[model samples]
Target: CWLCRALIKRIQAMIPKGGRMLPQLVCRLVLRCS
Candidate 1:
């Protein structure tokens, strides 16, 4: 869970502009991986 939280935080910080599509895709990937 910590890994997911850290990854989500990192992704949010890295994409502070907009277009959350990529992050959602990554979230799916994380879900699959976990």
Candidate 2:
């Protein structure tokens, strides 16, 4: 859980102003969960 959840937080919740959906793309690739 921590592995993906914790990572997802920073990915989309961190500096999202630069590129919000962009981070999700990375998360999708990294976790390959949902």
Candidate 3:
């Protein structure tokens, strides 16, 4: 379960400036870059 814990921690780090922004940024970065 170490990998799962680490993955969860990494995800938790992206929640500071509003959690929804993370996914929106990701979508823009991945899609718009292409």
Candidate 4:
């Protein structure tokens, strides 16, 4: 699979121990955010 480090970092920042990211949001964001 293809990957993006910047996207990973951004998503990492968006996440926390008790945080949540929906499948729809993440899926589209990963592609769109790139």
How accurate locally, in lDDT, is each candidate?
Answer: 0.67, 0.65, 0.70, 0.74
lDDT, candidate 2, 1-34, per-residue tens:
2578777777776664554444566665688566
Q: Model 2: runs farther than 4 Å from truth?
A: 18-34
How do all the candidates rank in terms of lDDT, highest first? Answer: 4, 3, 1, 2
**Could you give candidate 3's per-residue lDDT for residues 1-34 as a string of tens digits?**
3578888998798877735434576666677544
Worst 10-residue stretch by lDDT in candidate 2? 15-24
* Residue pairs that clash (backbone atoms under 3 angstroms), model 1: none
Question: Candidate 1 — which residues are off by over 4 angstroms?
Answer: 17-34
True-structure RMSD, every candidate = 19.3, 19.6, 14.0, 20.0
Model 3: ten consecutive residues of lowest lDDT: 18-27
> Which pairs of residues collide in model 4?
none
**Candidates ranked by TM-score, best first?**
3, 4, 1, 2
Q: Is candidate 2 or candidate 3 better by lDDT?
A: 3
